[PDB]
Amino acid sequence: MESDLIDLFEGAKKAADAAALDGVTSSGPEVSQCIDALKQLKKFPVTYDTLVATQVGKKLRSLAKHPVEDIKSVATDLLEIWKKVVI
């Protein structure tokens, strides 16, 4: 469902943002929560109209430019998967 997509992305962004603002390293819990949230999103069968209505795809670019490399890498991977799914 789209509500689940939105909720999972909100969790991921909250985590990534606490990690960036609290100066957390890769071994921090916020990074782990963001990583997990981003991994669950991979399994979501997103569609084009879903990405239009929710904009989660657009909003994931920010995470793909996160200062923590672990979050950035997993966000790039999530975008890579969704890419092949929607086109």
Coordinates of N, CA and C in Angstrom, one line a residue:
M1 N 0.9 -1.2 0.0 CA 0.0 0.0 0.0 C 0.9 1.2 0.0
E2 N 0.3 2.4 -0.4 CA 1.0 3.6 -0.5 C 1.2 4.2 0.9
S3 N 0.3 3.9 1.8 CA 0.4 4.4 3.2 C 1.7 3.8 3.8
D4 N 1.9 2.5 3.6 CA 3.1 1.8 4.1 C 4.3 2.4 3.5
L5 N 4.3 2.6 2.2 CA 5.5 3.2 1.5 C 5.8 4.6 2.2
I6 N 4.8 5.4 2.4 CA 5.0 6.7 3.0 C 5.6 6.6 4.4
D7 N 5.0 5.7 5.2 CA 5.4 5.5 6.6 C 6.9 5.0 6.7
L8 N 7.2 4.0 5.8 CA 8.6 3.5 5.9 C 9.6 4.5 5.4
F9 N 9.2 5.3 4.4 CA 10.1 6.4 4.0 C 10.3 7.5 5.1
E10 N 9.2 7.8 5.8 CA 9.2 8.7 6.9 C 10.2 8.2 8.0
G11 N 10.1 6.9 8.4 CA 11.0 6.4 9.3 C 12.4 6.5 8.8
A12 N 12.7 6.1 7.6 CA 14.0 6.2 7.0 C 14.6 7.6 7.1
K13 N 13.8 8.6 6.7 CA 14.3 10.0 6.7 C 14.5 10.5 8.1
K14 N 13.6 10.2 9.0 CA 13.8 10.6 10.4 C 15.1 10.1 10.9
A15 N 15.4 8.8 10.6 CA 16.6 8.2 11.1 C 17.9 8.8 10.4
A16 N 17.9 8.9 9.1 CA 19.0 9.5 8.4 C 19.2 10.9 8.9
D17 N 18.2 11.7 9.2 CA 18.3 13.1 9.6 C 18.8 13.2 11.1
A18 N 18.3 12.4 12.0 CA 18.9 12.4 13.3 C 20.3 12.0 13.3
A19 N 20.7 11.1 12.3 CA 22.1 10.7 12.2 C 23.0 11.8 11.7
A20 N 22.5 12.6 10.8 CA 23.2 13.7 10.3 C 23.3 14.9 11.3
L21 N 22.2 15.1 12.0 CA 22.2 16.2 13.0 C 22.9 15.9 14.3
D22 N 22.9 14.6 14.7 CA 23.6 14.2 15.9 C 25.0 13.8 15.7
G23 N 25.5 13.9 14.5 CA 26.9 13.5 14.2 C 27.1 12.0 14.5
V24 N 26.3 11.1 13.9 CA 26.5 9.7 14.2 C 27.3 9.1 13.2
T25 N 28.2 8.1 13.6 CA 29.0 7.4 12.7 C 28.3 6.2 12.1
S26 N 29.0 5.5 11.2 CA 28.3 4.3 10.6 C 27.9 3.3 11.6
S27 N 28.6 3.2 12.7 CA 28.3 2.2 13.8 C 27.2 2.7 14.7
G28 N 26.5 3.8 14.4 CA 25.4 4.3 15.2 C 24.1 3.6 15.0
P29 N 23.2 3.7 16.0 CA 21.9 3.0 15.8 C 21.0 3.7 14.8
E30 N 21.0 5.0 14.7 CA 20.2 5.7 13.7 C 20.6 5.3 12.3
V31 N 21.8 5.1 12.0 CA 22.2 4.6 10.7 C 21.6 3.2 10.5
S32 N 21.7 2.3 11.5 CA 21.1 1.0 11.3 C 19.6 1.0 11.1
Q33 N 18.9 1.9 11.8 CA 17.5 2.0 11.6 C 17.2 2.5 10.1
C34 N 17.9 3.5 9.7 CA 17.7 4.0 8.3 C 18.0 2.9 7.3
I35 N 19.1 2.1 7.5 CA 19.5 1.0 6.6 C 18.3 0.0 6.5
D36 N 17.8 -0.4 7.7 CA 16.7 -1.4 7.7 C 15.5 -0.8 6.9
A37 N 15.1 0.4 7.3 CA 13.9 1.0 6.6 C 14.1 1.0 5.1
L38 N 15.3 1.4 4.7 CA 15.6 1.4 3.2 C 15.5 0.0 2.6
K39 N 15.9 -1.0 3.4 CA 15.9 -2.3 2.8 C 14.5 -2.9 2.7
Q40 N 13.7 -2.6 3.6 CA 12.3 -3.1 3.5 C 11.6 -2.4 2.2
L41 N 12.0 -1.2 2.0 CA 11.4 -0.5 0.8 C 11.7 -1.2 -0.5
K42 N 12.8 -1.9 -0.6 CA 13.2 -2.5 -1.8 C 12.1 -3.5 -2.3
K43 N 11.5 -4.2 -1.3 CA 10.5 -5.3 -1.6 C 9.2 -4.7 -2.0
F44 N 9.0 -3.4 -2.0 CA 7.7 -2.8 -2.3 C 7.5 -2.7 -3.8
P45 N 6.4 -3.3 -4.3 CA 6.2 -3.3 -5.8 C 5.7 -1.9 -6.2
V46 N 6.6 -0.9 -6.2 CA 6.1 0.4 -6.6 C 5.8 0.5 -8.0
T47 N 4.9 1.4 -8.4 CA 4.5 1.7 -9.8 C 4.7 3.1 -10.0
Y48 N 4.6 3.5 -11.3 CA 4.9 4.9 -11.7 C 3.9 5.8 -11.0
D49 N 2.6 5.5 -11.1 CA 1.6 6.4 -10.4 C 1.8 6.4 -8.9
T50 N 2.3 5.3 -8.3 CA 2.6 5.4 -6.9 C 3.7 6.4 -6.7
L51 N 4.7 6.5 -7.5 CA 5.8 7.4 -7.3 C 5.4 8.9 -7.6
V52 N 4.3 9.0 -8.5 CA 3.8 10.3 -8.7 C 3.0 10.8 -7.5
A53 N 2.2 9.9 -6.9 CA 1.3 10.3 -5.8 C 2.1 10.5 -4.5
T54 N 3.0 9.7 -4.3 CA 3.8 9.7 -3.0 C 5.0 10.5 -3.1
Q55 N 5.7 10.6 -4.2 CA 6.9 11.3 -4.4 C 8.1 10.7 -3.7
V56 N 7.9 9.5 -3.1 CA 9.0 8.9 -2.3 C 10.2 8.7 -3.1
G57 N 10.1 8.4 -4.4 CA 11.2 8.2 -5.3 C 12.0 9.5 -5.4
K58 N 11.3 10.7 -5.6 CA 12.0 11.9 -5.6 C 12.7 12.2 -4.2
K59 N 11.9 12.0 -3.1 CA 12.5 12.3 -1.8 C 13.6 11.4 -1.4
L60 N 13.8 10.3 -2.1 CA 15.0 9.4 -1.8 C 16.3 9.9 -2.3
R61 N 16.3 10.9 -3.3 CA 17.5 11.5 -3.8 C 18.3 12.1 -2.6
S62 N 17.6 12.8 -1.7 CA 18.2 13.4 -0.6 C 19.0 12.3 0.2
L63 N 18.4 11.2 0.6 CA 19.1 10.1 1.2 C 20.3 9.6 0.4
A64 N 20.1 9.6 -1.0 CA 21.2 9.3 -1.9 C 22.3 10.3 -1.9
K65 N 22.1 11.4 -1.2 CA 23.2 12.4 -1.0 C 23.5 12.6 0.5
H66 N 23.3 11.6 1.3 CA 23.5 11.7 2.7 C 25.0 11.7 3.0
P67 N 25.4 12.4 4.1 CA 26.9 12.4 4.4 C 27.4 11.0 4.8
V68 N 26.6 10.2 5.4 CA 27.0 8.9 5.8 C 27.0 8.0 4.6
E69 N 28.1 7.3 4.3 CA 28.3 6.6 3.1 C 27.4 5.3 3.1
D70 N 27.2 4.7 4.2 CA 26.3 3.5 4.3 C 24.9 3.8 3.8
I71 N 24.3 4.9 4.4 CA 23.0 5.3 4.0 C 23.0 5.7 2.5
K72 N 24.0 6.5 2.1 CA 24.0 6.9 0.7 C 24.1 5.7 -0.2
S73 N 24.9 4.7 0.1 CA 25.0 3.5 -0.8 C 23.7 2.7 -0.9
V74 N 23.1 2.5 0.3 CA 21.9 1.7 0.3 C 20.8 2.5 -0.4
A75 N 20.7 3.8 -0.3 CA 19.7 4.6 -1.0 C 19.9 4.5 -2.5
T76 N 21.2 4.6 -2.9 CA 21.5 4.4 -4.3 C 21.0 3.1 -4.8
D77 N 21.2 2.0 -4.0 CA 20.8 0.7 -4.4 C 19.3 0.6 -4.5
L78 N 18.6 1.1 -3.5 CA 17.1 1.2 -3.5 C 16.6 1.9 -4.8
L79 N 17.2 3.0 -5.1 CA 16.8 3.8 -6.3 C 17.1 2.9 -7.6
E80 N 18.2 2.2 -7.6 CA 18.5 1.4 -8.7 C 17.5 0.3 -9.0
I81 N 17.0 -0.3 -7.9 CA 16.0 -1.3 -8.0 C 14.7 -0.7 -8.5
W82 N 14.2 0.3 -7.8 CA 12.9 1.0 -8.2 C 13.0 1.4 -9.6
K83 N 14.1 2.0 -10.1 CA 14.3 2.3 -11.4 C 13.9 1.2 -12.4
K84 N 14.5 0.1 -12.3 CA 14.2 -1.0 -13.2 C 12.8 -1.5 -13.1
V85 N 12.2 -1.2 -11.9 CA 10.8 -1.7 -11.7 C 9.8 -0.7 -12.4
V86 N 10.0 0.6 -12.4 CA 9.0 1.5 -12.8 C 9.1 1.7 -14.4
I87 N 10.3 1.7 -14.9 CA 10.4 1.9 -16.3 C 9.8 0.7 -17.0

